[PDB]
Design a protein around this ligand. Sequence first.
Ligand code: PRO
Ligand code: CL
Ligand code: K
Ligand code: K
Lengths: 259, 254
Amino acid sequence: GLTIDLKNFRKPGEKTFTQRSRLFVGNLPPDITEEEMRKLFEKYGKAGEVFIHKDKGFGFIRLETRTLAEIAKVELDNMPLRGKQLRVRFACHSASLTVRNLPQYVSNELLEEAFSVFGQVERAVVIVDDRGRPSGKGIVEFSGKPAARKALDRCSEGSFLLTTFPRPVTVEPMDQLDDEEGLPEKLVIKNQQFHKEREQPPRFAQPGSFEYEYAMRWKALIEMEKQQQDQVDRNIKEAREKLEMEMEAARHEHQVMLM
Amino acid sequence: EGLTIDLKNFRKPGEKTFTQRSRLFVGNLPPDITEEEMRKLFEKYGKAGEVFIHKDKGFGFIRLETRTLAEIAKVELDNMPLRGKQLRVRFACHSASLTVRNLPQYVSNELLEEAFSVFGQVERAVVIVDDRGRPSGKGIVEFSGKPAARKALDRCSEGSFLLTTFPRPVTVEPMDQLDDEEGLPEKLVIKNQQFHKEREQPPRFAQPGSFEYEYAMRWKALIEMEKQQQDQVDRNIKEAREKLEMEMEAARHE
Ligand code: PRO
Ligand SMILES: [Cl-]
Ligand SMILES: [K+]
Ligand SMILES: [K+]
């Protein structure tokens, strides 16, 4: 129990009522109403979309900002409602893309401006490392799936160039991984394979056991896989640096007559 | 006055308190900053643990109770004006975060936590999962301190750490900390002559007949070659793994 007066809950540049502030509400009573749902989230300010599935015991609600949705999720997840324990989660984004091979001088804003040609962009991010250096990867989140499908189609058919550098970007669907809730023990199916696997507890393979032989063979195979992958990485880097040099030398031949 | 919420739940189930996940960095502090003044700024975000203010540097650290409370404090206090300075409120960089790969099957967040607790005190352990709840085979292990993570990093490379009955050890590596939240704002880009040379041409599609069309087509071909190369490596690795397992099964006697 703690009361907080929220003065700043919208992040700089954050658009409101996006799919990033959309919550999934599951294990609802079969008789749930739109008004019941709205009352449940009343405390978390303004509400946008409220959708309840006609028969399936789940719905969606859009809150104003990520902060408000994060607070509502923590407070309302596992909340008892008429014999049911509610499941409140962030809704899976229907229109999120991974952008690879980003050139230099691409800002979040430029990424948004670039992809805004395909439809309404909710968010665009140029991913940076622990020293603020761009990784070469980015995220583009559209408001709807048709706009994301347009971007995917157009960027595979054509060569989408964000800057002067003649290297097109790669646009793929976002691989959505949950690194927050993960795999709780309760949700693991306790079948025959489960019990077979849990016979032995976490340990280090001890010399003189059947498993030590096999685990050492597995370690050797993993080291072989590392060597194989390192060679492919080196070949690709070399091939890319060759092409990137030709691209840089041919670009520095554009403004020759422009200026 | 803003939006007032009587918070009744700010701790996630199983969440440990005052961890590095709830630890915040506070830069651009005014020179006349005190521990009491710092505590009063964060007073509204509940109980505070560790409060550290650097000897002279004008930065500090504050541990809040939970990740939710730290997320609220960060959003509220970041880029706030205080004594002519605009505060920089960020999550403290995690000093003891690991990526576990080659996770066997039937590993849960709790099993991963029991397993890594042998090297030291575990803040959080997560089995990463996709959009259907199937495990990715990657996980996260966050320790309270750096020595526990270095211990796990060394031990798992020297030896074969097996989580289940399957005799395949897990791969432990430092966590690659990437920011997919703040990213690269236009404000942080130095608008020099190279900047303008790069932004001379706007986002567009390379048109046939242009020199850019020829280079983009060469790049597309190179990417397709890389995909073919990677697909072959993936196939070889899978085949090799399946082969090793079949040899082990043939060897096996109940
Ligand atoms: O992922 C694998 O290859 C095996 C299956 C059971 C335990 N781990
Ligand atoms: Cl930082
Ligand atoms: K711009
Ligand atoms: K367990």
